[PDB]
From a paper:
PCC 6803 serves as the preferred electron donor for the 2-electron reduction of arsenate to arsenite, catalyzed by arsenate reductase. The structure of the wild-type protein is comprised of the major protein secondary structure elements: four α-helical segments, and four mixed parallel: anti-parallel β-strands that form a single β-pleated sheet. Our random mutagenesis approach has yielded four new crystal structures of glutaredoxin A, one for each of the following variants: R27L, A75I, A79S, and P84R.
Due to the location of Ala75, one might have predicted that changes in structure and function observed for the A75I and the A79S variants would be subtle. Neither is involved in crystal packing interactions nor core packing interactions, and therefore, these positions are predicted to be highly tolerant of modification. Since ammonium sulfate is used in the crystallization medium of these glutaredoxin A crystals, there are two sulfate anions coordinated to the wild-type and to the mutated glutaredoxin A structures. Interestingly, the A75I mutation does not coordinate sulfate ions in its crystal structure. The large distance between the site of the mutation and the ligand binding site discounts any direct effect on sulfate binding. As there is no sulfate anion bound to the N-terminus, the His-tag of A75I is considerably more disordered that the other glutaredoxin structures that do coordinate sulfate. The same residues in the A75I structure without a coordinated sulfate anion show an average temperature factor of 32.6 Å2. While the elevated temperature factors can be explained by the lack of sulfate coordination, the rationale for the lack of this anion in this mutation is still unknown.
Numbering used by the authors: -10 to 88
Write the structure that this text describes.
């Protein structure tokens, strides 16, 4: 297959799984989104506007928390908008996304 291929035993190529639960018009959710979008990372947004079930699903994963947003990286619970910004401020976010 013609091209410049990288070898290092990746086998099956997968990248970090990045997830965010949101309300579309939540100013905190929007701030969190801006941040990831700024990084250029690939992520999945679970926009649960008016969805009671999904909030419950969320809470199950988010340590009982129903506040928004809720962020996850490689199935690790990161937390809310606050949390991710603190991580970025400390130089800790990029190693997770990761680089």
């Amino acid at each position: 297959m013609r091209g410049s291929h990288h070898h290092h035993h990746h086998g099956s190529a997968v990248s970090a799984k990045i997830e965010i639960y949101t309300w579309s018009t939540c100013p905190f959710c929007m701030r969190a989104l801006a941040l990831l979008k700024r990084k250029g990372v690939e992520f999945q947004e679970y926009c649960i506007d008016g969805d009671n079930e999904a909030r419950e699903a969320m809470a199950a994963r988010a340590n009982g928390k129903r506040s928004l947003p809720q962020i996850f990286i490689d199935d690790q619970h990161i937390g809310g908008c606050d949390d991710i910004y603190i991580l970025d401020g400390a130089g800790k976010l990029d190693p997770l996304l990761h680089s």
